[PDB]
Design a protein around this ligand. Structure first.
Ligand code: HK4
Length: 254
């Protein structure tokens, strides 16, 4: 069938990410036009309903193209109302979908390392999809865990061990950033610039001053979950199997 391989670039989404529409079928795809070898290699391993789908890649000279699932709903970031957040049932549904995606990644030994609402996209049915695997890495290979040491991520979402320890386990770092994303969804604000003792807001949290912002905006049930996720010691931090047993996580909301 002729021309079914031709795509028209119609608008810039985010190198650069463009919305491309198929000339014949009118199918919409996101095209990333450019570290890159690893991003493609990790994308080739991924297949999950809460992970932005990878269709393929092509290299036309010095320029590299990545064919990815187009998420028409845009970023979760744009669903968060500044200093308000969003309705608790929407935040719970997005958090369930985020946990499904992260469980999947950790199960195949991949850590995202940059979970934040700008990197969590929404499809036409508002289904959450983890995007941008540019900082992702393999932390488990041949059933052997590898401790990480590289400084990767975005400071307001990074776990405190990344700033304090030479080596650290990958999975609690992604759990922590999911807790900051949950905080942002329920309060429309980030709790601190970074999780350091020098940061007053971080010290206040460790001193359990939940009568302050953003915590005072969050109901006691999701706040009890945040108390288990945003634990400084990563060995004491709640694991995803235990997040799935949490009271607020399992609370029917409408
Ligand atoms: C799965 O791995 C990746 C996925 C993407 C992607 C993508 C993508 N798919 N669909 C969109 C985007 C960005 C974006 C940004 C948007 O707004 C800023 C947007 O609004 C509708 C849609 C989209 C980029 C690098 C990756 O490594």
């Amino acid at each position: 069938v002729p021309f079914v391989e031709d795509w028209d670039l119609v608008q810039t989404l985010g190198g650069e990410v463009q919305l491309a529409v198929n000339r014949v079928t009118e199918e919409a795809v996101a095209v990333k036009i450019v570290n890159i070898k690893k991003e493609i290699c990790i994308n080739k391993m991924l297949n999950h309903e809460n992970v932005v789908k990878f269709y393929g890649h092509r290299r036309e000279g010095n320029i590299q193209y990545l064919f990815l699932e187009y998420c028409s709903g845009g970023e979760l970031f744009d669903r968060i109302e500044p200093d308000i957040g969003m309705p608790e049932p929407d935040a719970q549904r997005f958090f369930h979908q985020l946990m499904a995606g992260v469980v999947y990644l950790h199960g195949i030994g991949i850590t995202h390392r940059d979970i934040k609402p700008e990197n969590l996209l929404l499809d036409e049915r508002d289904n959450l999809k983890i995007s941008d695997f540019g900082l992702a890495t393999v932390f488990r290979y041949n059933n052997r865990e590898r401790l990480l040491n590289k400084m990767c991520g975005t400071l307001p979402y990074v776990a405190p061990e990344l700033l304090k320890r030479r080596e650290f386990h990958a999975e609690p770092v992604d759990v922590w950033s999911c807790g900051i994303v949950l905080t942002a969804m329920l309060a429309g604000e980030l709790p601190w610039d970074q999780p350091s003792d020098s940061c007053q807001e971080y010290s206040d949290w460790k001193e359990k001053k939940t009568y302050l912002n953003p915590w005072k905006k969050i109901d006691s049930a999701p706040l009890a979950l945040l108390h288990k996720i945003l634990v400084e010691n990563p060995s004491a931090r709640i694991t995803i199997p235990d997040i799935k047993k949490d009271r607020w996580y399992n609370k029917p909301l409408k």
